[PDB]
Design a protein around this ligand. Structure first.
Ligand SMILES: CC(C)(COP(=O)(O)OP(=O)(O)OC[C@H]1O[C@@H](n2cnc3c(N)ncnc32)[C@H](O)[C@@H]1OP(=O)(O)O)[C@@H](O)C(=O)NCCC(=O)NCCS
Ligand SMILES: CC(C)(COP(=O)(O)OP(=O)(O)OC[C@H]1O[C@@H](n2cnc3c(N)ncnc32)[C@H](O)[C@@H]1OP(=O)(O)O)[C@@H](O)C(=O)NCCC(=O)NCCS
Ligand SMILES: CC(C)(COP(=O)(O)OP(=O)(O)OC[C@H]1O[C@@H](n2cnc3c(N)ncnc32)[C@H](O)[C@@H]1OP(=O)(O)O)[C@@H](O)C(=O)NCCC(=O)NCCS
Ligand SMILES: O=c1ccn([C@@H]2O[C@H](COP(=O)(O)OP(=O)(O)OP(=O)(O)O)[C@@H](O)[C@H]2O)c(=O)[nH]1
Ligand SMILES: O=c1ccn([C@@H]2O[C@H](COP(=O)(O)OP(=O)(O)OP(=O)(O)O)[C@@H](O)[C@H]2O)c(=O)[nH]1
Ligand SMILES: O=c1ccn([C@@H]2O[C@H](COP(=O)(O)OP(=O)(O)OP(=O)(O)O)[C@@H](O)[C@H]2O)c(=O)[nH]1
Ligand SMILES: O=P(O)(O)O[C@H]1O[C@H](CO)[C@@H](O)[C@H](O)[C@H]1O
Ligand SMILES: O=P(O)(O)O[C@H]1O[C@H](CO)[C@@H](O)[C@H](O)[C@H]1O
Ligand SMILES: O=P(O)(O)O[C@H]1O[C@H](CO)[C@@H](O)[C@H](O)[C@H]1O
Ligand SMILES: [Mg+2]
Lengths: 450, 450, 450
C-alpha cells in the first residue's frame, strides 16, 4: 500500500517574533522543514505535500520539486491545514502521516515504525506518543484495557488521576488516508480559538468504533516542537548531543562535544579527531585519520584519509589524502586538491584543480586553474582570471616553479619544468624547460639618503 | 530633590592577586567600575564621586570627566571611603546612593527604584536587599512589625532563628545625604579589623529613631561582588546569560548561548543570527536579518540590515546593507563600507570609504582612501599610504577596474571607468576612461632549463 | 633505595574502536602514555619500563630514550604484562610502581606519596585507593582492624555489607620489587577471561602474611582510566577543570573556563587575560599582563610581559615584551620577535629574527631573515628565500623602509636607513643610506577606453 505525508508549514509563528516563516529557521544549517522533509522521505513515503501560506516562495524555493504544495489562505488550525491537501490526496489510498514543519528532530526510524505499527494493526489512525517527566498541558494518552487508545484527554478536561499520566500525544499521527479525509469534513471549530484541531479526527474515529493505535517513541526529544528562539537553540543543542554521541560511539574523537557542531548528514571515519569549535554541515564525507583543527567550518565537502584542516573555511570542495590546509585558508566551491598537497596560510582556492604534490604555501589566489603535479606556487602569486566581464583559465604544468608575487594573466599556459622569475607579470605562454622573466632590473642610488 | 552617587573604587583587592586596582578588571570588555558608573548615571544621578587610592591614574583615566574623584590614603573601610567624598558632597541635599565598584551587574532599573522607594518613604536610609538560597555569612535583614528595618544582624551575632533568614543586605544603600555625613562622624573602628563599616551608620540612624527602609531586588545576581578571578568569570557568565536571554526574547537567533558573548550596550534587530563563538562588545548597533558568522569579534560598530560578517574582526567600523565581509577580514577604525559591498578574505580596510557596490575581494590593504561606486579592486592591490612620516590619501573613481598586484602610491587620483593593468605601480593621476600600465614586458628564454 | 616504574601500554584497546594503540590517543595535545611517563619521572623514579605490543614503533617513537621497552606478544592480562619487564627489572631492588598508560590524569604528587607511604611502612605492596560515589563493579578496599589491607573484594564476591564500601582500588600499586617478581611466578590464569590479573599478587602477598598497605588519594578523578572516546573527552574536561582552576587561583583571568584549553606544562604570569576559545599547549611560558585573544592557538612558545596575541597561530616561537601579533597572523617555528614589535594581519614569520621596534604590518612573509631595529616592512613584501633546492638568508638593517610589494631575492643584504621603492624586486645588496628601485615607469593611455 502507498504512503503519503503532509507537512504543516503555514502557521503564523507569532511566538518566533520573526518576519520569516517559522519552519524556515535553521537547525544545523538547514531549515526545520527540510529536516522534516528528509525524515519523511527517508521513511519510505511515496508523495509529500507541504501546506504553505501566503508569500511561501521561500519555502517552495527551498524544497523545490521534492514536495507538492497546497496553499492555506487563513491559519485556522492543524485540521484545516490538512484539509488544504485534498486536491493532491483526497482520492489516494494507503497510509498518510501528518508532521509539523517545526519538529526538526523527528527521526526517519521513528516514522518508519509509526507507519509499520499502523499498517500491521490495520488501524484507522495511530498516535505517536512519548513519556515526559513534566506532562502539564499536553494531551494525555488514555488507553483502554486492550492497550489501544481510549482517548487523548486535554489538561483542562482531565481528572486528577489522568493528570498523573506521563504518556502524552506528540501531535504526530498516521491515518488511513480515506478515513482521514472523510472525517475532516465533520471536524468543527466550536471552541475559543475558533480553530479546527487535528486530534478531533481521532475522537470522531473512536466515536464510530474505529481502531486507533498508539506507538510510543523512546526518545522524547525527537518530538520537540520549536515555537521560539529559546526552543530553537534547545533543538540545536539536542541535535548536537545526538550526532556527537553517534560519532564518538563509532571511533571519532571529539575533544569538546559542547562546542562542536556536526550536522546530521555528515559521515566521519574512525580515528579522526575533531578539535573544539569545529562546525561541519551539509553533505560532508570525512575519511579516517583526519584532523579537523579548531574553529574550522566545513560545508558540503569531501576530506580524504589523513588530511589536516587547520582553522580554515571549506565549502563544496574536495581534499585528497594526506593534504594539509591552513591555518587561515579558504577553499571555495570547486576547489579540488589532490593528495599530498599543501595549501598554506592566507591562500584562497576557487574552481581550481591542484594535482598531487602541488604546493601553494602562502598569500595567494588560485582561481579557474589547473596546477600540475609537484608544482610550487610562490608566495603572493595570483591567477588573474577576471577581465570584468568573463573568467579565463590558467594552466600550469608539472614540476614547475612559479616565483613569488607573479601575476599569471589568463588565458595563459605554463609548461613543465618552468621557472617563472619572482615579480613577473606573465601574459604569454611559456614552453617546457624555459625561464620567463618580466620585471625591471634594479637601480641602486648609493648615498641618496645621506 | 537632587541625587548623588558615591562609587567605592579604592580597595586593595588582595583576593584578586593583581597589581591593578580590582575595579579595573573587565566584564564584557569594560572595567567593572565603568559598568557601575553607567548604571548610576542611568539611574538619574546628578553628581558622581568615585573614591580612588594611590596610583589611581588608570581609574581616573578611564572614567574621565564623567565622575569627580576623592582620594582615600589608607584603606580603612567602606565608611571611611565614603567620608573621603566630604569635599564634594558634605553640604549637598537630597539622596545619595553608595555602590561598590566591584558590583558590575547592578542594573539602572534597580537603582532607580531603590532611590524612588527611599524618597517616597521619606526615609533616612534604605538598604537594598535580596533573597539568597545560602545566606551564611551575610548580614540578615531583620524587619520590625511595620515592615521597615529593625536591624541588619551579622552571622556572628544572630540567634539560630535569625540565621534561618534568607533576606540579606546587599551592601548597597540610599541615604539622606545630610544625615549620612552627620552620622559618619560617629562611626567608630572599635573592632578586630580596625575598620569603619558603612552599615554602622544604619544602626546609628536606628538608635536615633530614624526611619530605615528596605527595598528588595528580585535578581540576586545583580548584587554579586567580585573579589577573585573565579567570581570574575562568574560575573562574565551571569552577564552573558542576561543579555543572551534578552536578545532571544526579542527575535534574535543565538545558536549557542553558552559560547556567545554580547555586551550590555549592543542592540540587535530581529531575525538576525548570531553564530557560535561570536563576541560583540562596545556600543554596537546591528540591524535586522544580519548574520554574524562564527568566531567573529565586533566592537563599537554599526552593521546594517542583511549584512553578512564571516569569521572577521571589526572595530569602530560601519557596514552598509547587504554587504559581505570575510572570512578572515579585518575592518579597522574608520572603515566605512557602503551597501552591497564585498570585502573578501585576507583584506584589511582602515580609514577608507568603500562606496556602494565596490568590491575588494582578496589579499588587499585599503587605507586612507575612497573607492568609488562599483569599482573592482583586484587581488593583491595596496594603497601605499605611508612614507614613514605622514599618511596620504588615495582616490579611485567609479566603475573602475584596478588590476591585481597594483600599488597605488598616494597621493594619487584614479578616474572613472579606468583600467589599471595588473602588476603596475601607479605614481601619477590617471584620468577617466584611460588605461594605465607600469610593468616590464615578458622575456621568455625558451629551453633555458633543458 | 631505588625506584622503578612499569607503564602498561600494550593492550588491544578494543573499546576505543581505533587502529592505533589506546595510549597514543591524546589529552591536551599529548599521548596519554606521555602524561603518565611525565608523572612517573616527576615522582623520582630511577628507571621506567614501558610494556609495548606489536607494531609499537609509534609508542617507542614518542617516548624515545626516556623509557626502556619490553614486548608483550599476546595480551594475557596486567600481571602477564608486568612479567614482560623481567629482563630489565627482575634483579633490581627497591620500590616499583605499576601504572596503566591510559590513566593520564595521575599526578606526580600522588605517586610521590604512594611511594613514600609504601617505603615508610616497609610494606610488601601498597594499593592506591580512592572514594567514589558509585563503586559498583570496582574492587572494594576491605581493611583489617589495624587499618592495612585485608583484601580487595570484587563485586561478584562481595557480601551486601561489602558492596556498601565506597573505597575502591585504583589498579595502581607500589611493590617491593623482589617480592613482585617472586609472586608473579605463582599467579594463575584460572578464570573466564584466561587472564593473569595483577591484583592477584596482593592476595598472594597477604596469604603469606606480608604487609599490604593502602594509600588513599583525595582526587578520584586522577585515577580515571580511559577506555573509549566518551571517556577521552571526559579526561580532556577533567584536565581543563584542573588547570583552569589552578591558574585562576594564581592571578590569571580566564573569561570562559569551559572553552579555554591550557595544557599541564604551561606557566602563566599574573594579570594575564585568556580570552574564550584559546588553546595553549606544549611547554609554553607566558609572562605577566599578557592578553591572549580569542580563538588563538599557542604551542611550545615564550610570550613575554605585556604582549598581545589576537586570533593567531603560534608554534615554537618567542614574542618579546609589549609586542602585538595578529589578528590572523602565524608565527612558525624559529620566529623570534623582539620587544615593541608589530606583526599585523595575514603575516607569516618563519625562522626569522625581528629586532626591537620592527614592524611587519600586513600581508607579508618573512622567512630565514633578520629584520633590524625599527625597520618598517611594507604591505605585500616577501623574503624570497627558496630556490627549489635550498633556502637562503635575507638581512635588513636598522631604521630602514622596505616598500610595499617588494620581493627581496635572497641571499641579499639591505643596509641601514635604506628606502626600497614599492613594487621593486631586489636582487643586489643595497648599502646604507641608499634608495633602491626596480620597477617600470608608468604609461598612461589617456582616453584609451573612451
Ligand atoms: C630571475 C632569477 C630566476 C635569476 O636568478 P639567477 O639565474 O641566479 O641570475 P642571472 O643573472 O644569472 O639570470 C639568468 C638569466 O636571466 C636574465 N635576466 C635576469 N634578470 C632579468 C631581468 N629583469 N629581465 C630580463 N632578463 C633578465 C639574465 O640576463 C640571464 O640571462 P642570460 O643567461 O641570457 O645572460 C631569480 O632572480 C629569481 O627570480 N628567483 C625566484 C625564486 C622564487 O621565487 N621561488 C618561489
Ligand atoms: C595590460 C592589459 C589590460 C592589456 O591586455 P590586452 O589589451 O588584451 O593586450 P594589448 O597588447 O592589446 O595591450 C593594449 C595596449 O597596452 C600596451 N601595453 C601593453 N602592455 C604594455 C606594457 N607592459 N607596458 C607598456 N605598454 C603596454 C599595448 O602596447 C597596447 O597599446 P597600443 O594599443 O597603443 O598598441 C592586461 O594584460 C591586464 O593587465 N589585465 C588585468 C585584469 C585584472 O587584473 N583584473 C582584476
Ligand atoms: C620611488 C619613491 C620612493 C620615489 O618617490 P619620490 O622621491 O617622491 O619621486 P622622484 O621622482 O623624485 O624619485 C626620486 C629619484 O628616483 C628616480 N626614479 C624614480 N622612479 C624610478 C623608477 N621606476 N625607476 C628608476 N628610477 C626611478 C627618480 O628619477 C629620482 O632620481 P633622481 O633624483 O636621480 O632624478 C616612491 O614612488 C615610493 O615608492 N614610495 C613607497 C613608500 C612605501 O612603500 N612605504 C611602505
Ligand atoms: O493553521 C495552521 C496552524 C499551524 N500550522 C503549522 O502546524 C504546526 C504547529 O503549529 P504551531 O502552533 O506550533 O505554530 P504557529 O504558526 O501557530 O505559531 P504561534 O502563532 O502559535 O506561535 C506549525 O508547523 C505550523 O506551521 C499550519 O500550517 N496552519
Ligand atoms: O577601604 C576601602 C575598602 C573598600 N573599598 C571598596 O569597597 C568595595 C568593597 O570592598 P571589598 O572588600 O570587596 O574589596 P577589597 O579591596 O577590600 O579586597 P580584599 O582585600 O578584601 O580582597 C570595593 O570596591 C573597594 O574598592 C574602598 O574603596 N576602600
Ligand atoms: O594484556 C594487557 C592488558 C592491558 N594492558 C594495558 O593495561 C592497561 C589497562 O588495560 P585496559 O583493560 O583498560 O585496556 P585494553 O587494552 O585491555 O582495552 P579493552 O580491549 O579492554 O577495551 C592499558 O593501558 C593496557 O594498555 C597491557 O599492557 N597488556
Ligand atoms: O621555508 P618555508 O616557508 O617552509 O617554504 C619554502 O619552501 C617551500 C617548499 O615546499 C615552498 O613551498 C615555499 O614557497 C617556500 O616559502
Ligand atoms: O572568480 P572570483 O574569485 O569569484 O572573483 C573574480 O570576479 C570578481 C567579481 O566580483 C572580482 O571581484 C574578483 O576580483 C575576481 O577574482
Ligand atoms: O596606517 P596604518 O595601516 O596604521 O600603517 C601604516 O603606518 C605604519 C607605521 O607603523 C606602517 O607599519 C604600515 O606599513 C602602514 O601601512
Ligand atoms: Mg603582492
Amino acid at each position: 500500500m502507498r504512503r503519503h505525508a503532509i507537512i504543516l508549514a503555514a502557521g503564523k509563528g507569532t511566538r518566533m517574533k520573526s518576519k520569516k516563516y517559522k519552519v524556515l529557521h535553521e537547525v544545523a544549517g538547514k531549515p526545520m522543514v527540510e529536516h522534516v522533509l528528509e525524515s519523511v522521505k527517508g521513511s519510505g513515503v511515496d508523495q509529500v505535500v507541504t501546506i504553505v501560506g501566503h508569500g511561501a516562495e521561500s519555502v517552495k524555493g527551498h524544497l523545490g520539486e521534492r514536495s507538492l504544495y497546497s496553499f492555506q489562505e487563513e491559519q485556522l488550525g492543524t485540521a484545516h491545514a490538512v484539509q488544504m491537501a485534498k486536491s493532491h490526496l483526497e482520492d489516494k489510498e494507503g497510509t498518510t502521516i501528518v508532521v509539523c514543519g517545526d519538529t526538526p528532530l523527528i527521526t526517519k526510524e521513528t516514522l518508519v515504525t509509526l507507519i509499520a505499527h499502523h499498517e500491521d494493526a490495520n488501524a484507522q489512525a495511530t498516535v505517536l506518543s512519548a513519556s515526559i517527566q513534566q506532562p502539564y498541558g499536553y494531551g494525555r494518552i488514555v488507553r483502554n484495557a486492550s492497550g489501544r487508545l481510549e482517548r487523548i484527554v486535554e489538561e483542562k478536561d482531565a481528572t486528577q488521576a489522568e493528570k498523573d499520566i506521563n504518556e502524552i500525544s506528540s501531535g504526530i499521527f498516521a491515518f488511513n488516508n480515506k478515513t482521514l479525509f472523510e472525517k475532516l469534513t465533520q471536524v468543527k471549530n466550536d471552541n475559543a480559538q475558533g480553530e479546527y484541531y487535528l486530534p478531533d479526527v481521532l475522537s470522531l474515529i473512536l466515536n464510530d468504533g474505529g481502531i486507533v493505535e498508539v506507538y510510543r517513541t523512546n526518545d522524547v526529544e525527537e518530538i520537540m516542537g520549536v515555537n521560539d528562539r529559546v526552543m530553537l537553540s534547545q533543538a540545536e543543542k539536542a541535535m548536537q548531543r545526538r550526532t556527537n554521541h553517534y560519532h564518538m560511539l563509532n571511533g571519532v574523537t571529539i575533544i569538546d562535544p559542547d562546542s562542536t557542531y556536526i550536522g546530521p548528514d555528515v559521515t566521519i571515519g574512525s580515528d579522526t579527531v575533531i578539535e573544539p569549535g569545529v562546525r561541519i554541515n551539509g553533505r560532508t564525507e570525512i575519511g579516517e585519520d583526519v584532523v579537523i583543527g579548531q574553529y574550522s567550518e566545513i560545508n558540503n565537502s569531501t576530506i580524504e584519509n589523513g588530511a589536516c584542516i587547520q582553522q580554515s573555511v571549506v565549502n563544496d570542495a574536495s581534499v585528497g589524502a594526506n593534504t594539509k590546509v591552513g591555518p587561515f585558508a579558504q577553499l571555495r566551491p570547486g576547489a579540488q586538491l589532490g593528495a599530498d598537497v599543501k595549501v598554506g596560510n592566507f591562500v584562497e582556492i576557487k574552481k581550481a584543480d591542484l594535482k598531487d604534490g602541488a604546493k601553494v604555501s602562502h598569500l595567494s589566489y588560485i582561481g579557474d586553474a589547473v596546477i600540475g603535479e609537484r608544482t610550487n606556487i610562490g608566495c603572493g602569486t595570483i591567477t588573474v582570471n577576471y577581465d570584468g566581464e568573463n573568467k579565463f583559465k590558467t594552466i600550469v604544468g608539472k614540476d614547475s616553479f612559479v616565483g613569488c608575487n607573479v601575476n599569471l594573466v589568463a588565458p595563459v599556459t605554463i609548461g613543465d619544468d618552468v621557472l617563472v622569475a619572482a615579480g613577473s607579470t606573465i601574459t604569454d605562454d611559456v614552453p617546457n624547460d624555459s625561464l620567463a622573466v618580466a620585471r625591471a632590473r634594479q637601480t641602486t642610488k648609493e648615498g641618496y639618503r645621506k
